[PDB]
Amino acid sequence: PKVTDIANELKQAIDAKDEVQIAFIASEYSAESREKIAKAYVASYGKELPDDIKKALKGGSEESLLMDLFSDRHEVRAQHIRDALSGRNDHMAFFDTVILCTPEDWHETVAAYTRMFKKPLVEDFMKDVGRKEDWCLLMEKWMAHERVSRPGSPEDEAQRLDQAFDQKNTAYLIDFFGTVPSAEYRPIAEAFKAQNGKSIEQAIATIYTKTDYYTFYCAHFALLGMHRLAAYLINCACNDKGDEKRMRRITGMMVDKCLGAKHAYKIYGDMGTDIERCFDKRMAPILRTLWRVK
Ligand SMILES: [Ca+2]
Ligand SMILES: [Ca+2]
């Protein structure tokens, strides 16, 4: 329907103050569509769309979530990236903000970090994060976004992985996951599992621990596909006792790109259900709506 009438619907949801109905309208349209609806909306009422959401509803993550959803994806990201560095490194936020991201989104997020804070995002990050652990080095690699093709053959490149894993060539490792193109990763990993006795995800388990462990484990989910990384992040968000911050970072930032998470989630169970469980009566309905499990 006309983006003009869509803006109206929100305005009446924002009048009703109905968090779920706003969230529902959100769920209906991708980030780009929600950008067009945001415009229609400000011309209509001379009110910034996030500014009205903030207005009607007072609260926490639930509020901020609905705002993010009608705000510049890349600014939202650059602020999250600003925040995770503000106090002490928020690794959980790193994952959500660095690894759970397309190369395009990332790019504008870089650019948006300049507009906002007159700084080079990647400089700030390597400043705070350092280069002492593998997870740091991986993260720098990932952020560059230079996917280089791999010298043919899954199996052949799979056996090269598993050897890097055995010897503990954490250099190959970093560079692989830092550069392997996603399309090329799926076959390699299917192959790893078909030949090397241990899934890649177990390989990591053997070699890495703590925040080293999680970074690659996120990596591997993300090269399979964002909806896969998402599903996991959501799950982690569930076990960390309904992590509303994580859930707000990744949803308001990425839902449109990751709607298949509900199916990916099946390996952990029913997404709809677990959120009913882990998240309270305010946040959960909002969440179930966005990720389309009502
Ligand atoms: Ca408020
Ligand atoms: Ca709450």
Ordered domains of the chain (ranges, CATH): 1-71 (1.10.220.10), 72-145 (1.10.220.10), 146-225 (1.10.220.10), 226-294 (1.10.220.10)
Q: How far is the CA of 282 from the centre of ligand 2 (A)?
A: 6
Q: How far is the CA of 66 from the centre of ligand 1 (A)?
A: 11
Angle at 254 between CA 3 and CA 259, to 5 degrees: 85
Handedness of CA 17, 24, 68, 100 (dihedral sign): positive
Q: How far is the CA of 73 from the centre of ligand 2 (A)?
A: 23
Q: How far is the CA of 64 from the centre of ligand 1 (A)?
A: 9
Q: With CA atoms as reference, report the closest residue to 255 among 24, 88, 43.
A: 24
Q: If DSSP states are collapsed to H, E and C, what string results for 35-77?
A: HHHHHHHHHHHCCCHHHHHHHHCCCCHHHHHHHHCCCCHHHHH
- Residues 6+ positions from 25 with CB-CB distance below 8 Å: 6, 9, 10, 13
Residues with a beta carbon under 5 angstroms from ion ligand 2: 280, 282-283
Distances in Å between the Cα of 197 and the Cα atoms of 145, 186, 191, 192, 194 are 31, 17, 11, 8, 8
Q: 3-class SS at 292? A: coil
DSSP 256: G
Q: At what angle do helices 73-86 and 103-117 cross, to 10 degrees?
A: 70
- CB hemisphere CA count around 273 (13 angstroms): 6
Q: How far is the CA of 47 from the centre of ligand 1 (A)?
A: 15
Environment class of 227 (CB within 10 Å of its CB; exposed 0-12, middle 13-18, buried 19+): buried
Elucidation technique: X-ray
Q: How far is the CA of 61 from the centre of ligand 2 (A)?
A: 7
Closest ligand, as measured to the CA of 66: 1
Burial 60-77 (b: 16+ CB within 10 A, else e): ebbbbbbbbbbbbbbbbb
Q: With CA atoms as reference, report the closest residue to 108 among 145, 65, 70.
A: 145
Q: How far is the CA of 72 from the centre of ligand 2 (A)?
A: 24
Q: Within 10 Å of residue 145's Cβ, how many Cβ atoms?
A: 15
CB 185 within 8 A of CB 147: no
Alpha-carbon gap, residue 246 to 95, rounded angstroms: 9
